[PDB]
């Protein structure tokens, strides 16, 4: 189990780990988080208590450093770093440990929610979507743009998701533009997982991340591209069997996790009711519209 | 985006720009079967594609046999449309290609954009405009040309006649939209009014008839009275 400690507290925030979220107020002797399941990667985000305009956090990863936060009085916010003395973070950690200054990871033993929602997300193919290679671990924000969200404005603080674009020569072979845009199997199985992800479990993966980005951030382009990636399939009249079924399981720990209050601005209605009961996949995805139809149904 | 009365003019103004209208690309009678069930049976039909700045219309006939052995023809044919007007496009000299193609019906504007995604500086457009396009099989010549057809075959036309001579493309595209939405509205009547008089003939080269200034007056004032005349009717009025 690993440990992301704080040097200080200095101003009231709200600090998310995962899907967990606590409180600490301006000043409070609170130094860090203990206990972090290992094998998996994990975001600590925030939102101000003075400002609750940006949540930003960082995706990381234990397996691949020490990783600290120290609020940044300049900047005006908590920032992630990295320790390479490895004795000095040891017993930095020891000290707040044996004080009781860190909070626990409550994971609760049966549960496997965290691993459901990430189980394709890896940091490697993190750090290529989100670019800033001097740094192990990632930022994200609210108001961060993605590269599609820029083409309709800095690059360097972009979410380079993979575009995906019904109505464009990528999408449509010449000559096939009726079948090809009535049924997006090509895209999806040529263009996309062959050409692009190498394989579902990428394309999975980045399927987990927009969503995760839109829930814990309120990223509206993260949201887009969620929906665009559940769209592709849904969309395709060919869809390899074990791809639909683990879509069915990703989906549905999605719609569980989300808070029921952010429905209305996290769910796009038209997406859902096209995917639900009209798409080629209307009838394969039984779990998800279970859960939809029992928690959301007035979207539908 | 759509186009509409409060830009009328834009449509008579020098950037080339064609109008498209699918209504008569799959034509169908509805009859019983020996078991009496229902079964259709198609019709040639075609596709009105209209320069109403020139009046120049490009008639693709649409022959029955591209619906044998397809399913979903409704579907089908609007994205036949999209292909033939595409094809078309591509077969016209860069100058005399047009910059907007303005849809009749909205269910053409996915179709068409798609087949379309090589010209992303042509803007696909849809229309407020209620226009009687659909009357263009009430023309004779034109319908002629249609019903005899035996393979897929392009017909050029001007169906201003040699109105451009004497009124703007303004004036000549409201005499026209008059004329078809007359014909629409009461077929039977609207050729009567224009072929009443023995003594007035269309051109061999001509789609109507070859009426003076003051005869077209008369003729246009005769064309609202039976619009008026219907909708009285229609609505006991
Ligand atoms: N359960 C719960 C939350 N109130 C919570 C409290 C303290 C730490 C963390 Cl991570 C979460
Ligand atoms: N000294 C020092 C650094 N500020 C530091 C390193 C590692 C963990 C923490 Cl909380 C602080």
Redesign the pocket.
């Given at each position: 189990m690993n440990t992301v400690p704080f040097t200080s507290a200095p101003i009231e925030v709200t600090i998310g780990?995962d899907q967990?979220?606590?409180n600490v107020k301006e000043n409070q002797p609170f130094h860090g988080?203990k206990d972090i399941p290992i094998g998996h990667v994990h975001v600590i985000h925030f939102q101000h208590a003075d400002n609750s305009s940006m949540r930003y956090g960082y995706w990381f990863d234990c397996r691949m450093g020490n990783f600290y936060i120290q609020y940044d009085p300049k900047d005006g916010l908590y920032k992630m770093m990295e320790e390479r003395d490895g004795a000095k973070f040891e017993n930095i950690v020891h000290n707040f440990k044996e004080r009781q200054m860190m909070?626990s990871?409550?994971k609760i033993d049966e549960d496997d929610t965290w691993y459901n929602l990430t189980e394709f997300v890896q940091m490697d193919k993190i750090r290529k979507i989100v670019r800033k290679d001097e740094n192990q671990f990632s930022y994200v924000d609210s108001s961060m743009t993605t590269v599609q969200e820029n083409e309709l404005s800095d690059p360097a603080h972009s979410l380079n998701y993979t575009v995906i674009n019904f109505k464009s020569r990528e999408a449509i072979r010449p000559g096939h533009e009726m079948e090809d845009f009535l049924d997006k199997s090509y895209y999806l199985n040529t263009v996309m997982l062959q050409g692009i992800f190498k394989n579902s479990s990428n394309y999975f993966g980045e399927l987990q991340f927009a969503f995760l980005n839109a829930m814990f951030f309120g990223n509206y382009g993260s949201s887009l591209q969620w929906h665009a990636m559940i769209e592709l399939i849904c969309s395709s009249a060919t869809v390899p069997k074990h791809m639909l079924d683990k879509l069915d399981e990703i989906l549905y720990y999605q719609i569980k996790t989300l808070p029921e209050q952010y429905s209305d601005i996290l769910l796009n209605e038209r997406v859902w009711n096209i995917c639900l009961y009209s798409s080629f996949q209307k009838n394969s995805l039984h779990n998800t519209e279970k859960i939809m139809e029992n928690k959301y149904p007035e979207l539908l | 985006g759509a186009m509409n009365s409060s830009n009328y003019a834009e449509l008579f103004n020098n950037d080339i720009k064609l109008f498209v209208d699918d209504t008569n690309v799959y034509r169908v009678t509805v009859h019983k079967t020996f078991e009496g069930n229902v079964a259709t049976k198609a019709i040639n039909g075609c596709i009105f594609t209209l320069n109403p700045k020139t009046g120049h219309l490009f008639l693709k006939i649409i022959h029955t046999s591209v619906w044998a052995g397809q399913k979903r023809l409704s579907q089908l044919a609007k994205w036949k449309t999209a292909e033939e007007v595409s094809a078309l496009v591509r077969s016209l000299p860069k100058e005399e290609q047009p910059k907007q193609i303005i849809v009749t019906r909205k269910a053409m504007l996915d179709p068409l954009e798609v087949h379309m995604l090589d010209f992303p500086n042509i803007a696909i457009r849809p229309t407020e405009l209620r226009l009687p396009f659909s009357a263009a099989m009430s023309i004779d010549k034109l319908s002629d040309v249609v019903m005899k057809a035996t393979e897929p075959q392009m017909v050029l036309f001007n169906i201003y006649d040699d109105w451009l001579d004497r009124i703007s493309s303004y004036t000549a595209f409201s005499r026209l939209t008059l004329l078809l939405r007359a014909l629409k509205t009461n077929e039977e009547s609207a050729k009567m009014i224009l072929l009443s008089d023995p003594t007035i003939t269309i051109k061999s080269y001509h789609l109507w008839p070859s009426f003076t200034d003051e005869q077209w007056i008369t003729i246009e004032s005769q064309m609202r009275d039976l619009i008026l005349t219907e909708y009285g009717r229609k609505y006991n009025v």
């Open positions: 780990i967990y979220s606590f988080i909070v990871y409550p | -």
